Amino acid sequence: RQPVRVLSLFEDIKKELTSLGFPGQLKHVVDVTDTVRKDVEEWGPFDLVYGATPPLGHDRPPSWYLFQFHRLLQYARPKPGSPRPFFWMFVDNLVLNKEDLDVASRFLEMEPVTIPDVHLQNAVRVWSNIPAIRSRHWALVSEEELSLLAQNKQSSTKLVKNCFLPLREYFKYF
Amino acid sequence: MFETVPVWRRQPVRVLSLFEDIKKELTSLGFLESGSQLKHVVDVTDTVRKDVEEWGPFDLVYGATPPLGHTCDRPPSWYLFQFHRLLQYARPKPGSPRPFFWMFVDNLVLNKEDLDVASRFLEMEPVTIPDVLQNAVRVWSNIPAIRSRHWALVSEEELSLLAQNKQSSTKLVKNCFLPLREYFKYFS
Amino acid sequence: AEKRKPIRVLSLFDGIATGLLVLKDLGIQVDRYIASEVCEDSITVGMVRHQGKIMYVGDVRSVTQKHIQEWGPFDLVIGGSPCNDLSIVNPARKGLYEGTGRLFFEFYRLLHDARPKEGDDRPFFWLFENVVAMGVSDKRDISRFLESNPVMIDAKEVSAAHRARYFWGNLPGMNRPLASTVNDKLELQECLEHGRIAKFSKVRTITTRSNSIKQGKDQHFPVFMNEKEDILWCTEMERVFGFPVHYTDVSNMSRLARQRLLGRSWSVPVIRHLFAPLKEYFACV
Amino acid sequence: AEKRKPIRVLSLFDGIATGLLVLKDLGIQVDRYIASEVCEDSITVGMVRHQGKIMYVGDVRSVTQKHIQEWGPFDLVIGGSPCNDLSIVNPARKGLYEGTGRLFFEFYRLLHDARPKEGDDRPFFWLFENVVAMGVSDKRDISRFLESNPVMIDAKEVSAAHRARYFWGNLPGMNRPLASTVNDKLELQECLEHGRIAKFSKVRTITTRSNSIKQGKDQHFPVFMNEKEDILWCTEMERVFGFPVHYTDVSNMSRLARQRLLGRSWSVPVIRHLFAPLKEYFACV
DNA sequence: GCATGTGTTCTAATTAGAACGCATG
DNA sequence: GCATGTGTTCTAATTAGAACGCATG
Ligand SMILES: Nc1ncnc2c1ncn2[C@@H]1O[C@H](CSCC[C@H](N)C(=O)O)[C@@H](O)[C@H]1O
Ligand SMILES: Nc1ncnc2c1ncn2[C@@H]1O[C@H](CSCC[C@H](N)C(=O)O)[C@@H](O)[C@H]1O
- Structural domain boundaries of chain A? 1-174
Catalytic residue of the set D39, D83, D191, D284: D83
What letter does residue C127 receive in the DSSP assignment? E
Q: How was this structure determined?
A: X-ray
Residues of A in contact with D65 (CB under 8 A): 109
Sheet holding A87-92: strands in order across?
Answer: A26-29, A6-9, A48-52, A87-92, A122-128, A113-117
β-pairing, C54-56 vs C223-225, is unpaired
Q: Is C2 exposed, middle or buried (0-12, 13-18, 19+ CB in 10 A)?
A: exposed
Distance C38 CA to E13 C1' (A): 22
At D106, give phi and psi (nearest 5°): -65, -40
> Is the CB of residue B68 less than 8 Å from the CB of residue B163?
yes
Question: Nearest Cα to A46, choosing from A24, A76, A70?
Answer: A76
Reading phi first (left if > 0) and then psi (alpha if -120 to 50, else beta), residue C149 is in: beta
At B182 the three-state DSSP class reads coil
Question: Nearest Cα to C7, choosing from C130, C151, C122?
Answer: C122
Question: Nearest Cα to C18, choosing from C35, C32, C39?
Answer: C35
Sheet holding D228-230: strands in order across?
Answer: D197-198, D223-225, D228-230
Residues of A in contact with D141 (CB under 8 A): 33
How far, in whole angstroms, is CA D135 from its chain's centroid?
20
Helix axes D18-25, D268-275, angle to 10 degrees: 60
Determine the nucleotide nearest to D41 by Cα–C1' distance.
F14
Distance D186 CA to F15 C1' (A): 30
At C283 the three-state DSSP class reads coil
Alpha carbon nearest to ligand 1 atom 14, residue: C82
CB-nearest partner of C109 from B74, B75, B121? B121
The rounded distance, in Å, linking the Cα atoms of A91 and A126 is 5
Which residue on chain B is closest to C108 by alpha carbon? B85
- Answer yes or no: is C18 CB < 7 A from strand F: no
The rounded distance, in Å, linking the Cα atoms of D135 and D87 is 7
How far, in whole angstroms, is CA A115 from its chain's centroid?
12
D119 part of contact set with chain C, CB < 8 Å: no
CA angle C67, C68, C72 (to 5 degrees): 115
Q: Centre a 10 Å sphere on the Cβ of residue C223 and count the other Cβ atoms it contains.
A: 23
C149 part of contact set with chain B, CB < 8 Å: no
- The number of the ligand nearest the C-alpha atom of D41 reads 2
How far, in whole angstroms, is CA D71 from its chain's centroid?
23
* CATH architecture, domain defined by B1-188: 3-Layer(aba) Sandwich (3.40)
CA atoms within 13 A on the CB side of B88: 18
Q: How far is CA C71 from CA C11, C32, C39, C58, C241, in A?
A: 12, 9, 22, 14, 31
Told to judge if C83 belongs to the known catalytic residues of this protein, a careful annotator would answer yes
Which residue on chain D is closest to C247 by alpha carbon? D246
Q: Centre a 10 Å sphere on the Cβ of residue C21 and count the other Cβ atoms it contains.
A: 22
CB of residue C15 inside a 6 A radius of ligand 1: yes
Nearest chain D Cα distance for residue A64, angstroms: 6
The rounded distance, in Å, linking the Cα atoms of A83 and A34 is 29
Q: Classify domain A1-174 at the CATH class level.
A: alpha beta
SS3 track for B99-161: CCEEEEEECCCCCHHHHHHHHHHCCCCCEEEEECCCEEEEEEECCHHHHHCCCCCCCHHHHHH
Mutate to test the pocket of ligand 2, among D21, D264, D268 (most ligand atoms within 8 A of CB): D264
- Answer yes or no: is C245 CB < 7 A from strand F: no
The rounded distance, in Å, linking the Cα atoms of B169 and B150 is 30
Q: Centre a 10 Å sphere on the Cβ of residue C154 and count the other Cβ atoms it contains.
A: 17
Flag if D193 and C250 touch (Cβ within 8 Å): yes
Whole-number CA gyration radius for chain A:
16
Flag if C233 and D245 touch (Cβ within 8 Å): no
Contacts of B168 (CB under 8 A, 6+ apart): none
One-letter amino acid for residue C243 of the chain: F
> Is the CB of residue D148 less than 8 Å from the CB of residue D166?
no
Resolution in A: 2.7
What residues pair up with B105 in beta bridges, in sequence order? B64, B139
Assign 3-state DSSP to chain C and report helix, strand, coil percentages, each to 5: 35, 20, 50
At B178, give phi and psi (nearest 5°): -50, -55
The rounded distance, in Å, linking the Cα atoms of D211 and D221 is 10
The rounded distance, in Å, linking the Cα atoms of D181 and D172 is 19
CB-nearest partner of B81 from C105, C118, C147? C105
- Interface contacts (B, C; CB < 8 Å): 36
The rounded distance, in Å, linking the Cα atoms of C263 and C258 is 8
Contacts of C212 (CB under 8 A, 6+ apart): C204, C205, C206, C263
- The DSSP-derived string for D83-121 is -TTTBTT-TT---SSSTTGGGHHHHHHHHHHHS--TT--
- C59-64's contacts with Cβ under 8 Å and 24+ in sequence apart are C60/C12, C60/C13, C60/C36, C60/C103, C60/C106, C60/C107, C60/C110, C61/B117, C61/B120, C61/C103, C61/C106, C63/C36, C63/C106, C63/C110, C64/B123
Neighbouring subunits of C (3+ Cβ pairs under 8 A)? B, D
Q: Centre a 10 Å sphere on the Cβ of residue D4 and count the other Cβ atoms it contains.
A: 14
> Is the CB of residue A130 less than 8 Å from the CB of residue A169?
no
Query: Ligand 2 centre and the CA of D259: distance in Å?
Result: 14
Nearest chain A Cα distance for residue D66, angstroms: 10
- The number of the ligand nearest the C-alpha atom of D110 reads 2
The rounded distance, in Å, linking the Cα atoms of C281 and D3 is 61
Catalytic residue of the set C39, C83, C191, C234: C83
Neighbouring subunits of B (3+ Cβ pairs under 8 A)? C
